[PDB]
């Protein structure tokens, strides 16, 4: 249908984040919302293109686990409007304010992210940049997946990139499996409360080594209370070999299963 | 775009409610969802019409306060898929399990409903049957407006009907103001914790009296801690005269205002 918002309706408020490509403010439009605009008064032939891509992807999503797209606005300056999530990203909770979730909560956050990814993939959508920083814990309950990045469109989230992606296969190294790998790195964070390769201070080395298979997440750092089914589900997602990685439908069941026999 | 869900994908589970026109089951489709289907194997020339109306209205909505429409399914038996709300309706909380919310919570529930209605009206959509029974408290936190009715397409929620509607003005008595009136009756419930005219046991009398202006909600039953701005905002929404009733954009501001100066 038509998701364009007539100009003069949105009420841009406080600034939330500024990046190499686009800014994000907390706005007002039938309640709290979030606005993301280029800010660059000159719509680059490529910028206007990306805009159409993001919007074209968001309007194809309707799932409680995917950031809600409210509408776009081509009017005075390009902008995308999405629901306003109250809370912090999973990244922020884990490595910044170091929140200690319960094993049941962690497993739950994993199930929801999986549910979300399973949905995106079903709609034939590849995230390409799934990471704890793009997993939002709305109301400290209920995951919201999206792309909260502003640096990209140079930058790069190397820690969540599968080996075939870190290297460079024919044009598009991305695939449902590449996302599963990133998801594997997210499970690593939920289970260890830490980012991968924390003891290596050289990006180029991590890039090189991970790409050749020399380096891999240290699974012996998972919390003691971490179920075996989980630690295994993790190792399967991080498999260095693209094809050996499971798809989300199976990942979901695996989680939901170990979830049932957990409370006790 | 396209929202049709390929048959064989939805997994209808437990039955939640059965009505004169349609049934509602708790299903599975990329996580918990709700399915509403006619069940009548014979798509009435009017039933198929209503189906197109509901779906055409839901696909026009994208707001955290409006039930999320996941998709429809014309395949083997018409059906509508929406997110699954965990919790109980505002009606259930107030008059069935008699939950005692705090004044801050009540005011919050009012703000969210208002936010939702403000959105629907902006999209030029008239609810026509807004009532506590159609206000869902997702996780006892976060309002979700929708049409959880199954009786209609006889029955009638008289308590929330504006006078011009209870009577019988020309063809369509409904309007943005008629919804504001219902919203006024919802505020009455949040503020009194009771349904209107509880001391009158005759539907026909209530109908007649309310329609002539003889009867009106007893505002002197609002909780003692109920802000004046609220009790006033209520009385303005319940005005017997359609035109004297405010529209949601103004109702929202009014609430959000008295909301800021409340905590302390
Ligand atoms: C206090 N907390 C806030 O800072 C806050 C900030 C917000 O800012 C944002 C505003 C808009 C977006 N845009 C994306 O999300 N786009 C997207 C692109 C590709 C793909 Cl593939 C997808 C996908 F995966 F969802 F489908 C989504 C992201 C964040 C929103 C809510 N809350
Ligand atoms: C645990 N509690 C559950 O029972 C439960 C049951 C559910 O069942 C439902 C399934 C489908 C719907 N369909 C509508 O809502 N349609 C609608 C029509 C006109 C208009 Cl105007 C609107 C409006 F107002 F939203 F825009 C909405 C409603 C409820 C969903 C979630 N949870
Ligand atoms: Cl849509």
Residue with tokens 């039953």: B221
Query: Does A63 sit within 8 Å of B1, measured CB to CB?
Result: no
Q: Are A160 and A186 in contact (CB under 8 A)?
A: yes
> Are residues A116 and A208 located together in one domain of the fold?
yes
DSSP, res A66: B
> Are residues A230 and A166 located together in one domain of the fold?
yes
CA B150, B156, B162, B165 torsion: positive or negative?
Answer: positive
> Are residues A142 and A248 located together in one domain of the fold?
yes
Q: How many domains does chain B have?
A: 2
What residues of chain B lie within 8 A of the CB of A118, using their CB? 30
Q: Three-state SS across chain B?
A: CCCECCCCCCCCCCEEEEECCEEEEEEECCCEEEEEECCCCCCCCCHHHHHHHHHHHHCCCCCCCECCEEEEECCCCCEEEEECCCEEEHHHHHHHCCCCCCHHHHHHHHHHHHHHHHHHHHCCCCCCCCCHHHEEEECCCCEEECCCCCCCCCCCCHHHCCHHHHCCCCCCCCCHHHHHHHHHHHHHHHHHCCCCCCCCCCHHHHHHHHHHCCCCCCHHHCCCCCCHHHHHHHHHHCCCCHHHCCCHHHHHHHHHHHHHCCCC
- Spell out the residues 6+ positions from residue B23 whose beta carbon is closer than 8 angstroms to its own: B15, B17, B36, B37, B38, B39, B150
Determine whether the shortest distance from the Cβ of B80 to ligand 2 is under 6 A: yes
Catalytic residues of B: 129
Distances (CA, A) of A207 to A169, B93, B133: 15, 55, 56
- Spell out the residues 6+ positions from residue A137 whose beta carbon is closer than 8 angstroms to its own: A87, A88, A89, A90, A93, A109, A143, A144
User: A80-106 burial string, b = 16+ CB within 10 Å, else e?
Assistant: bbbbbbeebbbbbbbbeeeeebebeeb
Q: Which of residues 95-114 of A touch B (CB under 8 A)?
A: none
Provide the experimental method for this PDB entry: X-ray
Domain boundary among A54, A86, A118: A86
User: Which of B2, B3, B62 is the best residue to mutate to test the A interface, defined by the most A CB atoms within 10 Å of its own CB?
Assistant: B62
Q: Are A125 and A60 in contact (CB under 8 A)?
A: yes
> Are residues A121 and A23 located together in one domain of the fold?
no
CA A210, A213, A215, A219 torsion: positive or negative?
Answer: positive
Strand partners, B71: B81
Q: Which of residues 3-62 of A touch B (CB under 8 A)?
A: 3, 30-31, 59-60, 62
What residues of chain A lie within 8 A of the CB of B30, using their CB? 63, 115, 118-119, 122
User: HSE (CB half, 13 Å, CA atoms) of B208?
Assistant: 5
- CATH code of the domain in which A189 resides: 1.10.510.10
> Are residues A116 and A74 located together in one domain of the fold?
no
Domain boundary among A34, A69, A86: A86
The C-alpha R_g of chain A, in whole angstroms, comes to 19
Stated in angstroms to one decimal place, the resolution of this structure is: 3.0
| Tokens at B60, concatenated | 């026009």
- Spell out the residues 6+ positions from residue B236 whose beta carbon is closer than 8 angstroms to its own: B184, B244, B245, B246
Domain boundary among B61, B86, B111: B86
| Tokens at B174, concatenated | 């409904």
CA gap A236, B193 in Å, rounded: 53
Instruction: Give the CA angle between residues A59, A62, A68 to the nearest 5°.
Output: 75
- B64 in A contact zone (CB under 8 Å): yes
CA gap A83, A33 in Å, rounded: 5
- For residue A107, with 0-12 CB atoms within 10 Å meaning exposed, 13-18 middle and 19 or more buried, which class applies? buried
Cα of B115 to ligand 1 centre, how many Å?
21
> Are residues B167 and B260 located together in one domain of the fold?
yes
* Dihedral, CA of residue A195, residue A196, residue A202 and residue A204, to nearest 10: -120
In chain A, the residue whose alpha carbon lies closest to the alpha carbon of B118 is A30
Cβ-defined contacts of A163-170 (< 8 Å, 24+):
A163/A210, A163/A211, A163/A212, A163/A213, A163/A240, A163/A242, A164/A242, A166/A207, A166/A210, A166/A211, A167/A211
- Phi-psi region for residue B18, left (φ > 0), alpha (ψ -120 to 50) or beta? beta
Q: Are A58 and A116 in contact (CB under 8 A)?
A: no
Q: SS3 for A26?
A: strand
Cα of B135 to ligand 2 centre, how many Å?
9
CA gap B138, B119 in Å, rounded: 18
| Tokens at A8, concatenated | 């003069």
> Are residues B205 and B120 located together in one domain of the fold?
yes
CA B175, B181, B187, B193 torsion: positive or negative?
Answer: negative
Determine whether the shortest distance from the Cβ of B145 to ligand 2 is under 6 A: yes
Query: Does A63 sit within 8 Å of B31, measured CB to CB?
Result: yes
> Are residues B40 and B98 located together in one domain of the fold?
no
CA A203, A208, A209, A210 torsion: positive or negative?
Answer: positive
CA gap A159, A152 in Å, rounded: 15
CA gap A222, B41 in Å, rounded: 53
Residue with tokens 């100066």: B261
- CATH code of the domain in which A26 resides: 3.30.200.20
Catalytic residues of A: 129
Sheet architecture: strand order including A87-89? A87-89, A135-138, A143-145
CA gap B21, B48 in Å, rounded: 12
CA gap A137, A105 in Å, rounded: 11
Determine whether the shortest distance from the Cβ of A184 to ligand 1 is under 6 A: no
| Tokens at B11, concatenated | 């997994």
- Phi-psi region for residue A89, left (φ > 0), alpha (ψ -120 to 50) or beta? beta
Quote the domain boundaries for residue A229: 87-264
Cβ-nearest to A30 among B30, B63, B142: B63
Phi, psi of A35 (to 5 degrees): -115, 135
Query: Does B63 sit within 8 Å of A70, measured CB to CB?
Result: yes
Q: Nearest ligand to the C-alpha of residue B25?
A: 2
> Are residues A54 and A98 located together in one domain of the fold?
no
Of the candidates A183, A173, A102, A111, the one whose C-alpha atom is nearest the C-alpha of residue A142 is: A111
> Are residues B193 and B80 located together in one domain of the fold?
no
What is the β-pairing status of strands A32-37 and A69-73? Answer: unpaired
């Amino acid at each position: 249908d038509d998701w364009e918002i007539p100009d003069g309706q949105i009420t841009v408020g406080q600034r939330i984040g500024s990046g190499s490509f686009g800014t994000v403010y907390k706005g007002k439009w039938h309640g709290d919302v979030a606005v993301k605009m280029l800010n660059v008064t000159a719509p680059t032939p490529q910028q206007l293109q990306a805009f159409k891509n993001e919007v074209g992807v968001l309007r194809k999503t309707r799932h409680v686990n995917i950031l809600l797209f409210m509408g776009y606005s081509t009017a005075p300056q390009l902008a995308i409007v999405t629901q306003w999530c109250e809370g912090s990203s999973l990244y922020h909770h884990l490595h910044i304010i170091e929140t200690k979730f319960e094993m049941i909560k962690l497993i739950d956050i994993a199930r929801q992210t999986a549910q979300g990814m399973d949905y995106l993939h079903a709609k034939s959508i590849i995230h390409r940049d799934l990471k704890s920083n793009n997993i939002f814990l709305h109301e400290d309950l209920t995951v919201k997946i999206g792309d909260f990045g502003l640096a990209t469109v140079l930058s790069g989230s190397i820690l969540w990139m599968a080996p075939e992606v870190i290297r460079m296969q024919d044009k598009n190294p991305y695939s449902f499996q590449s996302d599963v790998y990133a998801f594997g790195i997210v499970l690593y964070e939920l289970m260890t409360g830490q980012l991968p390769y924390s003891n290596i201070n050289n990006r180029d080395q991590i890039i090189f080594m991970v790409g050749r298979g020399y380096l891999s997440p240290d699974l012996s750092k998972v919390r003691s209370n971490c179920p075996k089914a989980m630690k295994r589900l993790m190792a399967e997602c991080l498999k260095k070999k693209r094809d050996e990685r499971p798809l989300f439908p199976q990942i979901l069941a695996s989680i939901e299963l170990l979830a049932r026999s957990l409370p006790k």
